[PDB]
Amino acid sequence: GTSQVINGEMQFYARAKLFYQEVPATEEGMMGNFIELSSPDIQASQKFLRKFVGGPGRAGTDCALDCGSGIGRVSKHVLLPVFNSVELVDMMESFLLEAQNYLQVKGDKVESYHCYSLQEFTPPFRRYDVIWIQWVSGHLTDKDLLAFLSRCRDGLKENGIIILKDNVAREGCILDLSDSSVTRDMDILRSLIRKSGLVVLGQEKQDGFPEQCIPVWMFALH
Amino acid sequence: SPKRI
Ligand SMILES: Nc1ncnc2c1ncn2[C@@H]1O[C@H](CSCC[C@H](N)C(=O)O)[C@@H](O)[C@H]1O
Numbered sequence: 001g002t003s004q005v006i007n008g009e010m011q012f013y014a015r016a017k018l019f020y021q022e023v024p025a026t027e028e029g030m031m032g033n034f035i036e037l038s039s040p041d042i043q044a045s046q047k048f049l050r051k052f053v054g055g056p057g058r059a060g061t062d063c064a065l066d067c068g069s070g071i072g073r074v075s076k077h078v079l080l081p082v083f084n085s086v087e088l089v090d091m092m093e094s095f096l097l098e099a100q101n102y103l104q105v106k107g108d109k110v111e112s113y114h115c116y117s118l119q120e121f122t123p124p125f126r127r128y129d130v131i132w133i134q135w136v137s138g139h140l141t142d143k144d145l146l147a148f149l150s151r152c153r154d155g156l157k158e159n160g161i162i163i164l165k166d167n168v169a170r171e172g173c174i175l176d177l178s179d180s181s182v183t184r185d186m187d188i189l190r191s192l193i194r195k196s197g198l199v200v201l202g203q204e205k206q207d208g209f210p211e212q213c214i215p216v217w218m219f220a221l222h
Numbered sequence: 223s224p225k226r227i
Contacts, residue, residue, distance in 0.1 A: 032223030041224075135223055167225055176225065183225065214225045 009141055013117070015180035016139050017091065025098035030070045032179075040208035041216075042077045045134075045165065048204050048218045049078060052161050053130065059161045060129035063111075065089065067118060067152075068136025072099040072110075079132060080106050087128075089114035089121055119144035123155030131155055134165040138181040142192060149196035153222070161201060162221040164193070167214040183214055193221060 004010060023029040031038050053059045062084050066075045069088035079086045086109060090096050096113040103110050114121065119140055123131060131152045137145055152162050169183040176183070184192075193200065198221040206216035 030223070032225075034224040037224050209224065210226075212226050214227050216224065 012141065012180055013119075013139075015177075019179045020092050021094075025071050025095050025102075027071070027073055030073050034213075037209055037213075038073065038077075041206065044204070044206050044208070045074070045078045045218070048202075048220070049082065049130070049163065052163070052201065052220045053082065057159060059159050060157060063087070063128050063157075064130040064132060065123055065128045065155065067123075067131060067133040068139070069099065070095045071102045073102075074132055074134055075099075075110070076103055076106075079130070080109060083129065085109045085111045087112040087114060089116055089118065089123075091115065091117040118148050121148070122151050125154055126157055128155050129157050129160045131160070131162045132165075133162065135167075137164060137166045137189075138183055142188075146192050146196050149193065149198055149221075153197060156222065160222070162198065164219045164221060165206075165216065168217045169214060186217075193219065198222065 027038060028035045053061055061082055064079045064083040064086045066072060066079060066086055066088045069075060069090045072088055075086045075088060088096060088099055093115050096115055099113060100107060140148060167183045168189060169185045171185050173188055174183045201220040201222055204218045209216060
């Protein structure tokens with residue numbers, strides 16, 4: 001009867017899968033209605049990342065994890081130019097298959113394609129200098145995000161960091177029924193980061209986006 | 223992705 005459809009958590013995840021089943025495995029697909037914002041997104045990510053990697057006490061540059069990778073847009077444009085290797089994790093086999101083509105030029109530097117939902121994924125223990133989490137945290141419930149962030153801490157090499165990049169609402173938590181995601185406000189997101197046992201090393205707001213867009217923020221965590 | 227809102 002209605003016992004599954006009324007399980008909000010179950011439907012939240014199921015509806016997100018149904019959405020991504022129809023998203024093309026292309027940069028435009030990854031960017032939703034905003035392909036023109038890929039360029040300022042990347043530039044901001046490049047500027048932020050470089051402040052937290054390299055040299056004394058700062059993260060290493062050997063291996064990164066691209067969480068909610070999709071086809072690997074962040075891996076191609078942000079991570080692979082900095083790290084000696086990368087791994088991807090995404091729930092969609094479709095995107096991870098296409099990633100092998102999208103990332104072919106550096107295909108030998110992509111050590112694993114992990115097909116998991118993040119709420120069911122344990123980042124390999126102490127494997128990564130950076131764990132990058134972009135435009136996927138809003139697809140986890142608060143309890144699942146909290147637990148995933150805690151697991152991510154255990155995925156870090158010495159001096160490693162997590163970089164979280166996502167939309168941040170003015171107030172509350174706002175559900176988007178179309179893609180089955182939530183936008184969290186700053187207070188809620190920062191609370192979940194704190195409750196996970198992480199501390200914020202730095203933060204920066206995304207510049208160059210339209211005034212009509214939800215604000216986007218980057219956080220460096222450890 | 224980005225969003226409007
Ligand atoms: N619960 C979940 N676990 C793992 N991946 C998920 C997920 N919910 C959504 N995703 C993935 O999150 C991605 C969102 S689109 C953004 C892709 C990439 N971060 C980029 O910045 O270009 C999709 O690839 C989708 O399949």
